[PDB]
From a paper:
The [name]-[name]-2 N protein binds to viral genomic RNA and oligomerizes around it to form a closed capsule that both protects the genome from antiviral responses and directs its packaging into new virions. Beyond its role in nucleocapsid assembly and packaging, the N protein is also important during viral RNA synthesis, where it binds double-stranded RNA during viral genome replication and participates in the discontinuous transcription process necessary to generate subgenomic mRNAs. There are two stable, proteolysis-resistant domains, the N-terminal RNA binding domain (N-RBD), which binds to virus genomic RNA, and the dimerization domain (N-DD), which facilitates protein oligomerization and has some nonspecific RNA binding activity.
We determined the first publicly available structure of [name]-[name]-2 N-DD (residues 247 to 364), which was released on 22 April 2020 to the Protein Data Bank with accession no. The crystal belonged to the P212121 space group (cell parameters, a = 43.61, b = 122.32, c = 130.63) and was refined to 2.05 Å resolution. The asymmetric unit consisted of six polypeptide chains, which formed three homodimers. Each protomer contained 108 residues (257 to 364) that formed 5 α helices, α1 (269 to 275), α2 (288 to 295), α3 (301 to 306), α4 (310 to 318), and α5 (345 to 357); 3 η helices, η1 (258 to 262), η2 (296 to 298), and η3 (358 to 363); and 2 β-strands, β1 (319 to 325) and β2 (328 to 338), all of which were connected by five loops. The [name]-[name]-2 N-DD homodimer resembles a rectangular prism with a buried surface area of ~5,274 Å2. One large interface is formed by a four-stranded, antiparallel β-sheet, comprised of the paired protomer β-hairpins (β1-β2–β′1-β′2) (best depicted between chains A and B). A second large interface is formed by interlocked helices and loops (α4-η′1) (best depicted between chains C and D). The overall topology observed in our structure was essentially identical to the 13 subsequently deposited structures of the [name]-[name]-2 N-DD.
Residue numbers in the entry:
A (entry chain B), B (entry chain A): 257 to 364
Write the structure that this text describes.
């Protein structure tokens, strides 16, 4: 499976499918130890997935680029997804996202 | 319906769902005239969607951040998807992606 189509689960976790969390531009930085170990099996995964873009929104909202480097050809992507301040779970969504963004920095 | 979960089609095109293509930091720049008016009805949509990330890969591969500005709270994302240069279809993949990246510059 191409890396972009992989689905993390307890049997193929975030580390196995997408590598260690870290600070380099080539590494992902999202996920506490519980989400890394369980992937889509994570109890709060659906609350995180509501922010993931559809294939249409991924190519409709993102700034797409093509880069040819010594390591190969890359499809770059950047963008921002607005949370809904009126959503009654807004305060829980902020806490949940804060719990996984750069959570690796505190792993024992 | 959240912008990230929208699906562009002939009835609800890329401009109506994700705004006019353009060069600004959080403005979409992908799509020629044909893709903008057809969205997922585009006859070559599958060869574009093969590069869209699953929800799991989006949070596993990307660099996720969160910003609070006067417009609201935003989930920022950045990353790069490696193309398989060993795939016999690689040249066609490069041609297809380059046809839509910044295509808006050649038309009103
Ligand atoms: Cl699709
Ligand atoms: Cl999912």
């Amino acid at each position: 499976k191409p890396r972009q189509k992989r689905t993390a689960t307890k049997a193929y976790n975030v580390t196995q499918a997408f590598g260690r969390r870290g600070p380099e531009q080539t590494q992902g930085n999202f996920g506490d130890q519980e989400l890394i170990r369980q992937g889509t099996d994570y109890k709060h995964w659906p609350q995180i997935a509501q922010f993931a873009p559809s294939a249409s929104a991924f190519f409709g909202m993102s700034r797409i680029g093509m880069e040819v480097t010594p390591s190969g050809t890359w499809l770059t992507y950047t963008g921002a997804i607005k949370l809904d301040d009126k959503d009654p779970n807004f305060k829980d969504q902020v806490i949940l996202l804060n719990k996984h963004i750069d959570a690796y920095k505190t792993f024992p």
